[PDB]
Structure 1
Amino acid sequence: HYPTDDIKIKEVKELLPPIAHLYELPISKEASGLVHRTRQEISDLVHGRDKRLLVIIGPCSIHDPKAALEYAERLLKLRKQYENELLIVMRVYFEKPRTTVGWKGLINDPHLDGTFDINFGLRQARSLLLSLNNMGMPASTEFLDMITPQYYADLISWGAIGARTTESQVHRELASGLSCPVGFKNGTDGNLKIAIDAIGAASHSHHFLSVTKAGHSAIAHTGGNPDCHVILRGGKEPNYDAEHVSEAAEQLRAAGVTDKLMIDCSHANSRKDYTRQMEVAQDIAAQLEQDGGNIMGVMVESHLVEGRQDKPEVYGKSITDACIGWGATEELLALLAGANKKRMAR
């Protein structure tokens, strides 16, 4: 009798179920009001009901809950100051997907040492998200799989499906059942169609496999997500400018989906140079001053300290993509608030 099962598996280890973390860290009354309201505010932006700019801003990845909370405290002041022009939501992404060998993020490997203490990682992810909402800072994240949302999606005000998963049927099915609005990124080489197609798909009811909150194999039946939009994040060429926004809006309309979209200032639009994010934001500011009617949001990679590092030596400095630092963050946000004030007054 020859073996055929789990030939290339080292082990399969059962995790604590979502309900265990939910019981210790239940969503508070206050956090629930913030999440519910922020989801609605974002829906309003996606559908053109409000002309504030959604700003998804924060670290490329979270590797240190302390620095994340300090960052949130600073950002909250600006979220409040600019609340009439900008809707500021913090980036709380636990991982950056990659092709080469590297750190697999705070959920999978919280101790940053290849121990893969995932129960600890999931608990800390949830705890950080609860603390953020409790202080008044809504949180955004990317869902890379169909199981992690059960642990903490209740704390998430906006979700992303990245460039590498926007075309994936199962990630579209997930999005169709996410409680938050969802942005779909264009493809890594610039393909917009996959994201336009994703919005249409995700608006419908789907099924996908996952686990129940008690941790048991399950099929989820979704209602459809009416609050999806595209995210322009560059490709072979950047796609942040007015001509690209116009072309995207035309294609969105031709597909019968929302022509309000988000522009990522980072990643392929900055050509991985954090100092380009301000130049992208300047371009967006000019678009908002002139017309800019199809822009509902921007994404920015921002941390306490600018740049990046291979090892987590400097506090508040990214170990994944390079970020703008705090002073630049202040200037970028001022810029976009000033420009959108003018758009909103028209």
Structure 2
Amino acid sequence: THHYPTDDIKIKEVKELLPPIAHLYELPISKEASGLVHRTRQEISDLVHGRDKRLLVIIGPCSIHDPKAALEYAERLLKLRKQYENELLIVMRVYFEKPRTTVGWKGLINDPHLDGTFDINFGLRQARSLLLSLNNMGMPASTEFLDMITPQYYADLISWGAIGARTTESQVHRELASGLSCPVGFKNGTDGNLKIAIDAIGAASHSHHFLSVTKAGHSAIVHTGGNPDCHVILRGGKEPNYDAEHVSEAAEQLRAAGVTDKLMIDCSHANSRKDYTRQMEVAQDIAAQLEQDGGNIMGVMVESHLVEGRQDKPEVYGKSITDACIGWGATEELLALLAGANKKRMAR
């Protein structure tokens, strides 16, 4: 050439996203939602720092692919949230995407129509809409943040947030966490590395900068204040790491690092060895721990839907199309089991 091309050589298309502010204008957080979010955050902070011995329970589908079923799930769960409010602090898992190495559906935000149309403007509007409806009905929500831009669209509706095993060591994700309004859980690494999560809590506690967009949708540098409400999530690795031996080892490491030694345990994913029928075993092991001692457990995580298992196409209502989940009946047993176990712990 004269001028050889060097910009966007491997880019098919860049399209504007509607700014966060457009979504916020259509769907402003209500007074009720605001109160629920503010309260639930403070309450979760109390658990993280050992000021309250109630058990945080992040529970719900692996991924949200159908708002209607999410809203029905929320209705059922709400009754249990209330029933168990003295023993457990129940928050719905509302993740819009499962990260994956191979190609496949990129979730409800990226691809709301489930057909590779990538209608993100729609997806983001749908995602905000659901999160607002959840908070309005009295069901707080949690989610995993996969990038540094989506939080501007709906983090104001999030009571608890996660950074996944594949990004816990990522500098920029730690930076993000240090500025999220909600408490944040850092999952241990894919193969069980706990150190990255312990390091992440220390890092995310401090002030940081990272790049994102303003609510008006423009390139921005963000200066964080630190997030003092971070904690570990044990989700297994090569072997599961839910039992008392592992919880006690993690707590030693946490204390040795001088960060909170209250942690959360995932009943699904690697701790269930990718088998949804084993989540109850994990919970039952956690129940047992809480009865004997369990001083370092502040939370658990469970993959649960209306209907159990999984499907590869979205044919059955309330049935996951990502990781398999325990159905509603087992959800009822699992929660009873945890509430009764924790009732005793709080009394001791």
TM-score bucket of the superposed structures, by smaller chain: over 0.9
Take 2:215 and 2:183, find their aligned partners in 1: how far apart are those partners? 21
Take 2:140 and 2:70, find their aligned partners in 1: how far apart are those partners? 13
1:209 alignment partner, one of 206, 211, 227? 211
Take 1:127 and 1:292, find their aligned partners in 2: how far apart are those partners? 38
Q: Deviations over 1:315-336 (max 9, x none)?
A: 0000000000000000000000
The CA deviation at 1:237 is: 0.5
The CA deviation at 1:273 is: 0.2
Identify the residue that residue 315 of structure 1 maps to in structure 2: 317
The CA deviation at 1:244 is: 0.1
The CA deviation at 1:14 is: 0.4
Query: Counterpart of 1:307 in 2: which secondary structure?
Result: coil
Take 1:92 and 1:13, find their aligned partners in 2: how far apart are those partners? 27
Take 2:169 and 2:221, find their aligned partners in 1: how far apart are those partners? 21
2:29 alignment partner, one of 11, 27, 45? 27
- The count of residues paired between Structure 1 and Structure 2 equals 346
The CA deviation at 1:220 is: 0.2
Take 1:261 and 1:68, find their aligned partners in 2: how far apart are those partners? 27
Take 2:80 and 2:17, find their aligned partners in 1: how far apart are those partners? 38
The CA deviation at 1:294 is: 0.2
Please, what TM-score do these two structures have when normalized by structure 2? 0.99
Percent of aligned positions that are identical? 100
The CA deviation at 1:200 is: 0.1
Please, what TM-score do these two structures have when normalized by structure 1? 1.00
The CA deviation at 1:61 is: 0.1
Take 2:238 and 2:17, find their aligned partners in 1: how far apart are those partners? 40
Take 1:339 and 1:153, find their aligned partners in 2: how far apart are those partners? 32
Query: Counterpart of 1:311 in 2: which secondary structure?
Result: coil
The CA deviation at 1:256 is: 0.3
Take 2:322 and 2:26, find their aligned partners in 1: how far apart are those partners? 30
Take 2:269 and 2:276, find their aligned partners in 1: how far apart are those partners? 9
Take 1:261 and 1:271, find their aligned partners in 2: how far apart are those partners? 20
Q: Deviations over 1:191-215 (max 9, x none)?
A: 0000000000000000000000000
The CA deviation at 1:139 is: 0.1
Identify the residue that residue 135 of structure 2 maps to in structure 1: 133
Detail structure 1 runs of 4+ shifted over 2 Å in the superposition: none
Unaligned runs of 5+ in 1: none
Unaligned runs of 5+ in 2: none
Take 2:30 and 2:94, find their aligned partners in 1: how far apart are those partners? 19
The CA deviation at 1:42 is: 0.1
Query: Counterpart of 1:208 in 2: which secondary structure?
Result: strand
The CA deviation at 1:249 is: 0.1
The CA deviation at 1:49 is: 0.2
The CA deviation at 1:70 is: 0.2
1:103 alignment partner, one of 102, 105, 123? 105
Q: Deviations over 1:69-103 (max 9, x none)?
A: 00000000000000000000000000000001100
Query: Counterpart of 1:172 in 2: which secondary structure?
Result: helix
Identify the residue that residue 292 of structure 1 maps to in structure 2: 294
Query: Counterpart of 2:309 in 1: which secondary structure?
Result: strand
The CA deviation at 1:163 is: 0.2
The CA deviation at 1:239 is: 0.2
The CA deviation at 1:339 is: 0.1
Query: Counterpart of 1:124 in 2: which secondary structure?
Result: helix
